[model samples]
Target: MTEYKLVVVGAGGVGKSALTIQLIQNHFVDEYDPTIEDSYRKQVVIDGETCLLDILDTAGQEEYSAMRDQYMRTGEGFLCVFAINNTKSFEDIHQYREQIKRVKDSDDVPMVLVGNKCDLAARTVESRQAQDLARSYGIPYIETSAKTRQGVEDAFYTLVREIRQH
Candidate 1:
């Protein structure tokens, strides 16, 4: 069976863990607790073939920056996430993208730019802006709400599809 490593990254309280948990366990976590690093594995079908997906839900704190290299280096695909209500979270996306490119040493690496917490009524970063940025990076853009379970599956499935195609 094929195995793929996927990394979920964003600033603190951006719902990286929520998204990962919602995808793997099918539940939403409301509390905001910083995660250092957590790994989850599941079997999924891609193009009619079963594959093992190893998901690494990474910490968004500044201190965890040093460990990001290891996660980036080992990751095959990435879900660069941010909360729609937080502009600062969105601002760091380029840095994450650059780090992935630097660590993977390939501009063609598979990645998806995710805007989470879409259930919020107030959004600081508009979808068009995020979409345009994803367009510039030549990556897919997705919006998800872990609380409502909206687009969460699509984000992970899309990343898996990208990994398979890569």
Candidate 2:
């Protein structure tokens, strides 16, 4: 079986794990406790292609910066998830990027900028701002909403396609 390691990361309560669960299972996680510790591994099918995806959904509020660092070690790619309703979560990508650098000790890692929570556009905290940041960083960005399943599959499939091309 083909396998790939990917990380879903962002600030506390930005719905990293929620998105991961929803995308893989097609259900919303209700009453999710951000303080609770959680992680999972799942297999996904995309256009008849099956991938054994090691998805490390991590919390950012705790001092688990090392978790983020460690996951990036053998990671083929990273999904820097940020809630569109939380600006700080978007900005926190820098720290996440730095942590990966600390672990992998490199600046040339494949990444996809994901602005999650598109369902909450009314409460947007990072709109075109995310696109601008992605452009500046020389990566692509997608506005996603796990709640509505908007742009959900694209985020992962696009990352895979981009990583494959490289």
Candidate 3:
């Protein structure tokens, strides 16, 4: 079986952990504390292909900013997540993409731009805006709701497919 290493990254409280947990466990967490860092391993079958998926949920806190380069260096692909209701988080996504390029030393990195918290209607970043940003980076953009479990699987599976292609 092939193994794919994926890293979840975004600002604090942006629901990165929620999405990761829902993907691996099929459960939604109501309350989430800031993650220092965590890893999860699972066997997932996508498109009839079985593979070992290793996910790293990294700290989103600014204090842990220094460690992002290390995480960027190790990930085979990334989920650049941001809450739809948080504008600032959306603004900082370029930095994540840039860091991944700098650390990986490759421009052809596999990644998905995720607008999380889609269940919430009080969104500050419009879907069109997010789509434009994803287009600018030439990456796929997905809107996911961890609570409703919408688009979560597609986002992950799409990324794994991209990684496999890469």
Candidate 4:
């Protein structure tokens, strides 16, 4: 079966873990500790094509920053996760995106810009602003609430679509 390695990246507390858990576990988790490096694999179908989907959940804090490039090299696709409640979380997404492109040595790789944590707190990141950034990178954008389970699946399968593009 065709397999794809999907990497999740963002700043600390950007709901990266939650987004990943929902994809792999088929449920949401709000109170998990920081991850050093985690992996999940499953047989799945997207848009009529069956794929062995392997997801890599990386630590988001700078303390675990050293481990990023290693996974970035092997990542076939990426979900650039960011939280909607915090603006700074959104800013650090660029670094992750840039690092992915740098480590992968290509910009044509499959990547989806995700705005997560849309369920609670006052919104700081405007919707249009994020779409503009997505357009700048020529990638698709999706908003999700891991707590509410909104748009989580859509964001994940979109990466598969992008992977099929290449």
Top TM-score prediction, candidate number: 3
Among residues 3 or more apart in sequence or in different chains, the pairs in candidate 4 whose N, CA or C atoms overlap within 3 Å are none
lDDT of 4 by residue, 20-118 (tens): 888778878868588888999878888887888899989887799989989999989999999998899889989999999999899777899999988
Candidate 1 lDDT, 118-156, residue by residue in tens: 999999999999999999999899999999999997888
TM-score of 2: 0.86
Error of 2 at 48 (Å): 4.8
TM-score of each candidate structure, all chains considered together: 0.95, 0.86, 0.97, 0.95
Give the residue spans of candidate 3 off by over 4 A. Answer: none
Instruction: Quote the lDDT for 140 in model 3.
Output: 92
lDDT, model 2, position 28:
76
Task: Assess candidate 2 and give its lDDT.
Answer: 0.73
Question: Candidate 4: RMSD over Cα atoms?
Answer: 1.1
lDDT of 2 by residue, 1-166 (tens): 6666667767888777767878777887766666333556667776688877666677767766556555677677778888888878878887777676667776756778888888874655656788898887677798788888888778876666556655
- How far residue 107's Cα lies from its native spot in candidate 2, in Å, is 1.6
